[PDB]
Design a protein around this ligand. Sequence first.
Ligand code: HEM
Ligand code: 1Y6
Ligand code: CL
Length: 393
Amino acid sequence: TIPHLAIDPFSLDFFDDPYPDQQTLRDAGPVVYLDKWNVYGVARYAEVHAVLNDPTTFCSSRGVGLSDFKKEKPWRPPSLILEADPPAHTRPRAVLSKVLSPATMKTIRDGFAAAADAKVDELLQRGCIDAIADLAEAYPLSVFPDAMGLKQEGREHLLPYAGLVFNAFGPPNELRQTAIERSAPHQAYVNEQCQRPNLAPGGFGACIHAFTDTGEITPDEAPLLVRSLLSAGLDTTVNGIGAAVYCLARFPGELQRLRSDPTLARNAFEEAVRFESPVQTFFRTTTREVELGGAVIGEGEKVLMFLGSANRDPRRWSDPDLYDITRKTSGHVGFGSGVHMCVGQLVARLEGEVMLSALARKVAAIDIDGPVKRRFNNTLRGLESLPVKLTPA
Ligand code: HEM
Ligand SMILES: O=C(O)c1ccc(F)cc1
Ligand SMILES: [Cl-]
């Protein structure tokens, strides 16, 4: 009753062009079985959304990667928020929510926006640039580590550590094995910067340590919550901003619409998150026998959610393969859905919005003028290099 597919959604060929295989997954049925890794898969919007919104049945405390924490030791101490279920999840979530709250965005917006404008001005002086290294990477690196309160020394560890983290959610393939093999120096840096004395005052990190006296978290919980922001807060935005630039580069009609109304910047980034889904996948583990779209999944089974596929499901979206900066994007799962829905989505949108705003006001055309190279990662979708010529407005 449940179709079995040999598709490896973590192979390089899949990363190179996932969309045909994603339609195959959606159309095979609401619940598939991936023989390659012995996990269930859900690729339609309806089933992804249902699984995300039943944390009791599809839990996260046994890991949101392939590995089942009840069977294997996690490669690092479990995340106190990502890899926790209610009620243990509730109070750590509340703290990060306040640390990254609407009121906090107001304190950093002017600095984030100034840095966004300043980078686009700098890029326009060079003309031909790499929209990944020189923009998608350089901008988040110029605002986020500082907003965290990190010292200058050792920041080169941040992107490699993040790549390690997202590769580690994947199966024990060469991408994962090789990342873990090189991890030691990056883990040492990150763990050390999570200690209270190493986080500058007023930053995200210090604000986390400052919440240890409310009874929501204890002092020994703060370092791991800082580790969460250093895991999830940088590499995701690099791929989100790179996706937006890529879309604008591929769809000049939409760059022209954005230039004509720069207040479309925030939705243009949201549509970019739906269209490329930088975070492609996450796992859950069944805590009991469950019926999901006619399939009977037993207890203790891994369920792979195709977030990027759900965001392109024609059962949910009109013209899903078209980048539309005026699309009503509410409901996309690029940030997840439910109790675990990205707690840092206000930071991501702020970064994305003020960068697209700078582009909308300062750039007339974005033309690819070099070989595009993809960056392969078991969980993240994005580009290694995106040579573009920026024409000033
Ligand atoms: C384009 C940018 C981003 C994308 C696409 C993204 C994606 C996601 C997704 C899909 C989840 C759900 C995980 C799950 O359901 O198991 C999530 C959770 C999370 N994100 Fe983001 N993220 C982004 C940026 C950020 C930023 C900027 C931060 C912090 C500054 C952050 C921190 C977190 C944390 C801590 C969680 C765990 C929340 C929880 O378990 O309750 N992310 N993110
Ligand atoms: O360490 C965490 O808590 C975390 C890591 C990755 C991610 F996408 C979200 C949260
Ligand atoms: Cl670590």
